[PDB]
């Protein structure tokens, strides 16, 4: 079928600021594996329904993947505000698709911190929907140029998740997969059985 397994069952996930996107098209997909499962902590869908989606077609389907905290899963939704929504991953108000998240304490948490999962902490303006900002330029909080060195009024824009297995459920990492469905007036390359 369509490479859904390569996304959900991926060995390693990307940081939320550098969220990966996989283009799924020109294939026939089976959606039964997802909603029948129970390992998904949250399965929220806007506009479309995974049940009754098996006998449907779509022109383009995107699979966005990233890792965030439990507290920040609620921000992956249309019309939501917060550090993750504003500065890392923003969904449009007319979003059509699903957001799927599950706990990954066993996979992404490491003793002494992961050091590799990062989220954007400082940004002068909010992200537009489906925008990825991978800049590591030093954030200039004042009028003095930073010259690419951290210091007063000059911070590193990215903050590292201290993912540890001894944290609470909220602090534990969650792997999030966002499915975006398009049915534009065009030949439909993504269909079910």
């Amino acid at each position, epitope marked *: 079928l369509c490479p859904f397994g390569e996304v959900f069952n991926a060995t390693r996930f990307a940081s939320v600021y550098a969220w990966n996107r996989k283009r799924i098209s020109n294939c026939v997909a089976d959606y039964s594996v997802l*909603y*029948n499962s*129970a390992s*998904f*902590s*949250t*399965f*929220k*869908c*806007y*506009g*479309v*329904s*995974p*049940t*009754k989606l098996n006998d449907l077609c779509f022109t383009n389907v995107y699979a966005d993947s990233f890792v965030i905290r439990g507290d920040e899963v*609620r921000q992956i939704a249309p019309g939501q505000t917060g550090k993750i929504a504003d500065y890392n991953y923003k969904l449009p108000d*007319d979003f*059509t698709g*699903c957001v799927i998240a599950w706990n990954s304490n066993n996979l992404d948490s490491k003793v002494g911190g992961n050091y590799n999962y990062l989220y954007r902490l400082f940004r002068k303006s909010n992200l537009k929907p489906f925008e990825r900002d991978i800049s590591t330029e030093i954030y200039q909080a004042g009028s003095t140029p930073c010259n690419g060195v951290e210091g007063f009024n000059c911070y590193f824009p990215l903050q590292s998740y201290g993912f540890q297995p001894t944290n609470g459920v909220g602090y534990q990492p969650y792997r999030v997969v966002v499915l*975006s*469905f*398009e*049915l*534009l*007036h065009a030949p439909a390359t993504v269909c079910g059985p």
Partner: antibody
Amino acid sequence: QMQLVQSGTEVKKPGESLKISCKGSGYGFITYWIGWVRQMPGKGLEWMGIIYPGDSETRYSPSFQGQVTISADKSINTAYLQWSSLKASDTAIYYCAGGSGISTPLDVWGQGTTVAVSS
Amino acid sequence: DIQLTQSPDSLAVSLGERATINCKSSQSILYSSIIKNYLAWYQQKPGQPPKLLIYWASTRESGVPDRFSGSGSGTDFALTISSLQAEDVAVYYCQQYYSTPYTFGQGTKVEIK
């Protein structure tokens, strides 16, 4: 498919508190949102509100937000509609419907719960 | 918020003929990414809870008789029943699921001629 079962018939008085139940049994309740519909005696359907059991995200109709409260318990796959001060106008039959997402049709419906409030 | 008016309130159609129930919308119910109008049709037989018949105003639910069919776009939509039977005698509602809050029509009773 999925199925919904509601609570039983109740007759109350103006000034009492009431809480009704709607438990869903099926395959894939994680994807389902639960709504509430009121049908006044010999009248049409009225949409009250909706809730997602996983995070209890509750949305209310502007005509019902101030006097109803919708809750859920994902442990028992049950949604609840509750009142504090019942009124004679609340006398109706209440249905709960289940959709597989927001902005989706109500595929699954409950059998309904009859409420009567009078002096 | 988004209104939905039906017509006619009552309708009597003889067996084997065609029924027509109209549904007018205050705003367009068409999405940008899916290009399908978010309208649904329901059937509520007496004593029984409403049952979903047609979603997206064109697609029929599984187990629905082929005589039921949906049509319309923009703000004008309709439900048509060809070769009417006694089972199709119920009050029909059109409901939008474009955005919360959901709204229903006032209902359309289908009597017998």
